[PDB]
């Protein structure tokens, strides 16, 4: 099997930048094909036969390379251009794909917009209690969120989940959900979730008290 290793695996480029993602084949191939897949969509033939641009593709995209090493190059990164680009070889059997190169847009470091919520009565009456925490619109994705219950860190029961970079402002949003029993809930008062992000010297704190805030 002709392995196809892509390099780099993931990258952040600012708009208007020149990107060159490569593709190395383990054994020589004739052509290489490139695919573009955006999160939640199927792949799209981007450039085939190494140099040919498919219909729709912008002229800033170009394919080059020969025998063992090929490459895609974007003359100027566009917002639209963020995606994962796979290299494919059909010159041998079976057909193989590249590891993928994830493209992300580099932008201005932002701080998150934290919001805290207490268990809904519906949930509370159900027997469980989850305190949710939304950390909206930040860049970089690197962010640390800690749950503190009466000044005590809870590790187990926390459910984190980042979104894929926002198409409009190019930022990520987080969501941490600490889940405990109704019993554990009604015993502790100060619930705090703090984001130790890269824009914060001091962690962004959001806190609430179980009975009156």
């Amino acid at each position: 099997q002709i392995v196809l290793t892509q390099s780099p695996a993931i990258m952040s480029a600012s708009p208007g930048e020149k990107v060159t993602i490569t593709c190395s084949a383990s054994s020589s191939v004739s052509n290489i094909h490139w695919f573009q897949q955006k999160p939640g969509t199927f792949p799209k033939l981007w450039i085939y036969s190494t140099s040919t641009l498919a219909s729709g593709v912008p002229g800033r995209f170009s394919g080059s390379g020969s025998g063992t090493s090929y490459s895609l190059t974007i003359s100027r990164m566009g917002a639209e251009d963020a995606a994962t680009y796979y290299c494919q070889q059909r010159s041998g059997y079976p057909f193989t794909f590249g590891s993928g190169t994830k493209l992300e847009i580099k932008r201005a470091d932002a701080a998150p917009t934290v919001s805290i919520f207490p268990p809904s009565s519906e949930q509370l009456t159900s027997g469980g209690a989850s305190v949710v925490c939304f950390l909206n619109n930040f860049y970089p994705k690197d962010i640390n969120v800690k749950w503190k219950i009466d000044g005590s860190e809870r590790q187990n029961g926390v459910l984190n989940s980042w979104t894929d970079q926002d198409s409009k402002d190019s930022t990520y949003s987080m969501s941490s959900t600490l889940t405990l029993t109704k019993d554990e809930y009604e015993r502790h008062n100060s619930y705090t979730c703090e984001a130790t992000h890269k824009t914060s010297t001091s962690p962004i704190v959001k806190s609430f008290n179980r009975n009156e805030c």
Partner: protein, 198 residues
């Protein structure tokens, strides 16, 4: 419009068999070879094999032979792929491709597991601009739809815990609208459940 409409998402026992559909349109069905691609966890696209329509000529990846069985229906212009002896390792997204990988199918998401389907419990998230939220807790098959009435919406990807998925959604609206105007969150499926909230 050339379109390859594949069948919907499916959940199957580790041992069960499944047959994915791919009914094509807008192009000479028989002029091109139908391909099937496997999309594992993340970024792992694998060529399972192909078949030549009308002529039924197959060509398989050595790895998928035995489990895979590509067949076709020249009349209904529908390709098929049967996957038998499924395991958790066979859970992924499945595409069919044509005109030399130019036309791709929408994809069929398959989950192989003994875990029982489960209707979710949706919870309204009010405070204590106005930021609000909706939490849908505990459903098993991964597909779920969250909308708000009908845009500061932020739906977060589902995360699986103890054979149950959990998804949240935040929407940021202005103070001069809420509560005078209701903000409801609509949730759909998991166990044929459809729920509206606040």
């Amino acid at each position: 419009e050339v379109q390859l409409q594949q069948s919907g998402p499916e959940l199957v026992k580790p041992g069960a068999s499944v047959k994915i559909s791919c009914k094509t349109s807008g192009y000479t069905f028989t002029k091109y070879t139908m391909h099937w691609v496997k999309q594992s966890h993340g970024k792992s696209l694998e060529w399972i094999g192909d078949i030549n329509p009308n002529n039924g000529g197959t060509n398989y990846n050595q790895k998928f032979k035995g489990t895979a069985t590509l067949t076709v229906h020249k009349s209904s212009t529908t390709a098929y792929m049967e996957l038998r002896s499924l395991t958790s390792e066979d859970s992924a997204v499945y595409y069919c491709t044509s005109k030399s990988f130019d036309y791709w199918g929408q994809g069929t998401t398959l989950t192989v597991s003994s875990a029982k389907t489960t209707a979710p419990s949706v919870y309204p998230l009010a405070p204590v601009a106005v930021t609000l939220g909706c939490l849908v807790k505990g459903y098993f098959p991964e597909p779920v739809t969250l909308t708000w009435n009908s845009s500061g919406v932020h739906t977060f990807p589902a995360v699986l815990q103890s054979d149950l998925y959990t998804l949240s959604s935040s929407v940021t609206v202005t103070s001069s609208t809420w509560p005078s105007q209701s903000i409801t969150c609509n949730v759909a499926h998991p166990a044929s459940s459809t729920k509206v909230d606040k």
